[model samples]
Target: GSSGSSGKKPEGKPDQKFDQKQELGRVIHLSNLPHSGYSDSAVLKLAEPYGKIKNYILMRMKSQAFIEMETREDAMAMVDHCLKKALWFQGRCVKVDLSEKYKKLVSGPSSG
Candidate 1:
């Protein structure tokens, strides 16, 4: 189990600066986001400053999402600037989720 788990973890030392470098902004529960009312670009524009957005999604039940970045530093910058700030979309201030749940749902096993 350890081998399998380690195999999946990000390689090399976890960015030590990630704590200071990675900006974990406003954490939101997924169910709060509106259903089907926004475009990717709209959200991207708001998140672009948080370094190149490597991944993102607005899932069902309004679950949270993880916004990965090219560098932890950029992530930090984004979080520093936007943390707790409201993300307007579809006429509402959407919440940003910076939790493990977002990433887990995106990468978890799925049935075809």
Candidate 2:
């Protein structure tokens, strides 16, 4: 019972390098946000400087929301800015990232 777990670690070193360029879209990912409360109002204050917001799908129940800017340019800029600085809101920290699938999650019919 001295050596229980696996001694060799699963260090993977695959063959070729996948250097396919990924295109950044208009959707931004906001994570680790408040469930409700400050997420709403503070969200507005957040995008004040970086406007051009198109649309979104707010999955805040998990403390995360998807924000789509009017253009892909704005989305990329916003993510870069937010990622560098620490996001402090509602007495908690938050996160920001880019979403490649911008149009996939936005716009659809419901209540059938």
Q: Candidate 2 lDDT (Cα, whole model)?
A: 0.68
| Candidate 1, 1-112: lDDT as tens digits | 3454554566566544434534443322222455565665755666675657666555544433445555556655655554556656566566554554433224546866
Model 2 misplaced regions, further than 4 Å: 1-24, 36-41, 109-112
The models' CA-based lDDT, in order, is 0.52, 0.68
lDDT for each residue of candidate 2 in 72-100, tens digit (9 for 90 to 100): 77766777787688767676687877766
Q: How far is candidate 2 from the true structure (C-alpha RMSD, Å)?
A: 15.3
RMSD vs true structure, all candidates: 11.3, 15.3
Off by over 4 Å in 1: 1-31, 100-106, 109-112
TM-score against truth, every candidate = 0.48, 0.61
- Global local distance difference test of model 1: 0.52
Lowest-sum lDDT 10-residue window in model 1: 22-31
